[PDB]
Scaffold this active site. Structure first.
Site: not given
Ligand SMILES: N[C@@H](CC(=O)O)C(=O)O
Ligand SMILES: N[C@@H](CC(=O)O)C(=O)O
Ligand SMILES: N[C@@H](CC(=O)O)C(=O)O
Ligand SMILES: N[C@@H](CC(=O)O)C(=O)O
Ligand SMILES: N[C@@H](CC(=O)O)C(=O)O
Ligand SMILES: [Zn+2]
Ligand SMILES: [Zn+2]
Lengths: 310, 146, 146, 310, 310
Positions: E54-55, E84, E105, E134
């Site tokens: 997603r992100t 390296k 990330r 986050h």
């Molecule tokens: N849920 C968010 C991603 C995230 O949770 O960082 C998306 O679909 O853009």
């Molecule tokens: N959304 C969380 C991961 C998860 O949904 O467990 C993260 O990217 O930190």
């Protein structure tokens, strides 16, 4: 002719008070008066599918001090069951045509029991099946106790550490309960508390026992302090929070103990017993292990000899 | 009485939803022998119950053993020439054969070729079964559970 | 056959050995509705057979068709007021859903949250099941349980 | 709205002789007259859960050649499905929330169809799903067979190699079956034979096809020799005897070849096509691969743009 | 120069009620009026040293939806840091030499802050740093909570699951705490409880919050039920008993639910949200995920473009 002749030795649960002190009486006899060829033409199978130093080494030494021969293995990686997919049943089935008796330690509980259903007239001796039973361990334990305390009656016994997976304390508590007046102190994490079936048995004979959070609250009352290692090879992932000891015994916090008090441990020990406890008069885990030799020597003769005078 | 048939045996007072588990868990439908079944039949004693009618067949100990810790109140009775010749109760032996499976995953009974076996210490609370191999005890609410 | 139902469905002329199948397959017994079933029963039209009556439960025409590859020969009587108020017959369906399992191990249906599904067709003297997902085709004989 | 606008392209079996002709028709237009901005403001996901060189790079090049921008992954090990246990259904549900279309390749059969059930209005383009279908591959093959034969009718075609697991032959055989008078030769080991559902489908149209054990038997008659690589990744351990190519085309086996005849291969090839064949004039797999560019701009244009093209 | 122009977005704790409102305000503008060329001539790095579906995909889609071009990696195994031995500091120093912004990330807490200390004038956007923060996730949650509740005030919100390791709850709790009269319910195992520094922060504002052991206790009062997946990757072996979801929302637990109430989940979900819940009208995690698109175009626009938008 003796009561243990040709008998399987699987669970303390199938033994009487008599059988136990019968093997202890023999042990005492043998340690004082050694008999080098009690079983000169015997061939015993030593089969370990798990890991071990004490139980397997004490056992084979015993067979030799009694003039018997030994075959067997310390791991099954090279047996037919380890490479060709052979069942335990078949393994026991064929080995029982080669030997007079089979000593075995296996990773699953009940493996010894299963073995006796395929060994015919061959007596099977359980060196420990998973976390269930460890009969020969308690045999030597009782011998050690008998020795230091001069009694197996109304003793104040404390069992520490992993009581859930300790086949050692499972078998030892069943045995001590065949005697009168013994009081038990259970010091263990709630996750490794010491099984119900054990406590229920203790209730059936209505004998004293109680849980405790520390060693010091029972130090002054105990005659035997039985220490245990965390079975970090048998526990569930949902229990990895228990790998570390919890109760650690040191020389210092041993001040208010009774003079006759003896510190026991089936071994091996990791951190639960500081090495500074070793130079104290209470430490007795090594002398204890040394007694495995007389106890298992005693068992091997009773099972393989119709009679024996000494 | 309640609409019988020549020979055979009737299993009355089966608890609801347990009836069908018997037909299967006991290969009961393995025959050409006229069978009659009634599920969720109304009863003036249990509220609602199941009932099987196996024509020209019988039990005794072959399976009235399991029925015990299953239909503790079921009523098995033989019928000859249209007549109930023997009402029976749950003969619940302390030993149960192979139709069962030990919960302790590390029990050797799973890996190896041996018919399961349990000892049945019937405490008045719930039922406990001790394994012949691993020696661990449980509750029939766990051994018979899904 | 015991006695007549007031309102509901009676599946008549089920072959022998199938009535139990159908019970197991479509979980017809997972209900609180009075069910009366009779296996092995003298008929006249056919030799003998199985029957399944189920109270206050009706079947859509496809639901009835689902019986096609089990009891091709069969009648389904929709019953109201102890009287047959409509009778139906199993005509092969277009597809069979979520009851069978795709025999193809590399099919996506096994791992994801989706109901199974196969298209139906007769080939030779047999019906072939084509999986909606993996598109691989199998004789109904192999496509099984679950 | 052309017939293919906003459509899912997941299995040739769902396409008509017309659908295919429309795609190729379009390819030629775009090939002849590139439309650099046809898909400006479009974001397509390129999701490959399995390996790919040709179909993933050509697809992406196409998207850029039409002005669309691309997002995705070529390895599923760093997606949430790969490290956090997410289902593919959820993976599609969220992705269908960002892009205008989803081109996806997956190791399980039926994956692309599964996606269509969760991508809502976002069309799914199957870039290969296990050993099932490979629609965009067939599109380019046809465009290629057409570009060098002048037609898709009454052609003699041989398909050799792994026909059981070739998602390539499964689709192409179905595509040509939708045309008239094409003969088929299946040169493949008994274990990797064309599957029944393809033969049955052929029977239904009274299409001529037969099994052969050598390229030679048909070398003189064939117009298209379509070679395939054995799908070692798809093999069950028991079909492992067929890992090595059983038929190897060498430049010397092309002596008696219809001068029009071309050699095709969806690629990659291991040894089924000796490098000495690359120089011969019957060599067309690389050209074939280059056509993928046009077949894919075409398909893309038709699915994300309602008007036919000039 | 808007308040967020050329800013580092690494921890909600550094943001003000105004900063957040400006982001959402902008999202709505862009959502309502897409600005396809807002970021033409921009090159942003997408650096994911840890998994993401997603992100990472939404962020990249956003950059293209605003005309920016993107470079980066989704796996650090093929960077110089991966083969390296390069430090992350150096990795940032050279990268900050190519792009206009860095979305990153990382598996270690604080990584994004570390970067800001070496990226010179190039702003760093924290897309997740270990189990800490986050921020862009909170932005979309708020935009979503706002889109379905009509406001960010006096809302009753439940957060269940892994609150200790959820970088998601850590940020969101802090975000809502910046608003007025919001009640908090923490449904989580003792081992994965919301951390102290979040509770202490709440106390400082006299915000009402309390721990519960079931969704039911609060089901009737809640406006937002925000579910989380247990962070197995973050768990110490000793918290392994909590790997399996302890609270599972089923469609049947939604019987007594405020009709306005919505179910959210930052995703991915394992089983904490039964698929039968997807059809219910309280299902909004997928919509929630789609909003990420707007929250991210917004944040991007504000950091790389000085003017507010029309
Ligand atoms: N849920 C968010 C991603 C995230 O949770 O960082 C998306 O679909 O853009
Ligand atoms: N959304 C969380 C991961 C998860 O949904 O467990 C993260 O990217 O930190
Ligand atoms: N003595 C234990 C192991 C240990 O405590 O180290 C056993 O063999 O069961
Ligand atoms: N072209 C095949 C792979 C191969 O050529 O073996 C596919 O992608 O399905
Ligand atoms: N050969 C095609 C790819 C494929 O076979 O899918 C190309 O080069 O575009
Ligand atoms: Zn057992
Ligand atoms: Zn399938």
């Amino acid at each position: 002719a003796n009561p243990l002749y040709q008998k399987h030795i699987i669970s303390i649960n199938d033994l009487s008070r008599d059988d136990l002190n019968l093997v202890l009486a023999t042990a005492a006899k043998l340690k004082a008066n050694p008999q080098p060829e009690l079983l000169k033409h015997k061939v015993i199978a030593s089969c370990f599918f798990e890991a071990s130093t004490r139980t397997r080494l004490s056992f084979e030494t015993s067979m030799h001090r009694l003039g018997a021969s030994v075959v067997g293995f310390s791991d099954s990686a090279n047996t037919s069951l380890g490479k060709k997919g052979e069942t335990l049943a078949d393994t026991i089935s064929v080995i029982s045509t080669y030997v007079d008796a089979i000593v075995m330690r296996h990773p699953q509980e009940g493996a010894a029991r299963l073995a006796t259903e395929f060994s015919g007239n061959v007596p099977v001796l359980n060196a420990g099946d998973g976390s269930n039973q460890h009969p020969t361990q308690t045999l030597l334990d009782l011998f050690t106790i008998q020795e230091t305390q001069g009694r197996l009656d109304n003793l104040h016994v404390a069992m520490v550490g992993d009581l859930k997976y300790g086949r050692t304390v499972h078998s030892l508590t069943q045995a001590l309960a065949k005697f009168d007046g013994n009081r038990f102190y259970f010091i263990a994490p709630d996750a490794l508390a010491m099984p119900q079936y054990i406590l229920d048995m203790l209730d059936e004979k209505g004998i004293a026992w109680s849980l405790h959070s520390s060693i010091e609250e029972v130090m002054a009352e105990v005659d035997i302090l039985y220490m245990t290692r965390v079975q970090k090879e048998r526990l569930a992932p949902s229990e990895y929070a228990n790998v570390k000891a919890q109760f650690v015994l040191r020389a210092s916090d041993l001040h208010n103990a009774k003079a006759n008090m003896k510190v026991l441990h089936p071994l091996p020990r990791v951190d639960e017993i500081a090495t500074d406890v070793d130079k104290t008069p209470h430490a007795w885990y090594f002398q204890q292990a040394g007694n495995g030799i007389f106890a298992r020597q005693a068992l091997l003769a009773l099972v393989l000899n119709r009679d024996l005078v000494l | 009485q309640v609409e019988a048939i020549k020979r055979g045996t009737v299993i009355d007072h089966i608890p609801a939803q347990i009836g069908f588990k018997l037909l299967s868990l006991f290969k009961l439908t393995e025959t050409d022998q006229r069978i009659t079944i009634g599920l969720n039949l109304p009863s003036g004693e249990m509220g609602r119950k199941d009932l099987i009618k196996i024509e020209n067949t019988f039990l005794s100990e072959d399976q009235v053993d399991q029925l015990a810790l299953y239909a503790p109140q079921a009523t098995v009775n033989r019928i000859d020439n249209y007549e109930v010749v023997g009402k029976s109760r749950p003969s619940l032996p302390e030993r149960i054969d192979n139709v069962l499976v030990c919960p302790n995953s590390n029990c050797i009974s799973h890996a190896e070729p041996v018919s399961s076996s349990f000892a049945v210490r019937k405490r008045a609370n719930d039922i406990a079964l001790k394994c012949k191999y691993c020696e661990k005890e449980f509750s029939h609410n766990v051994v018979l559970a899904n």
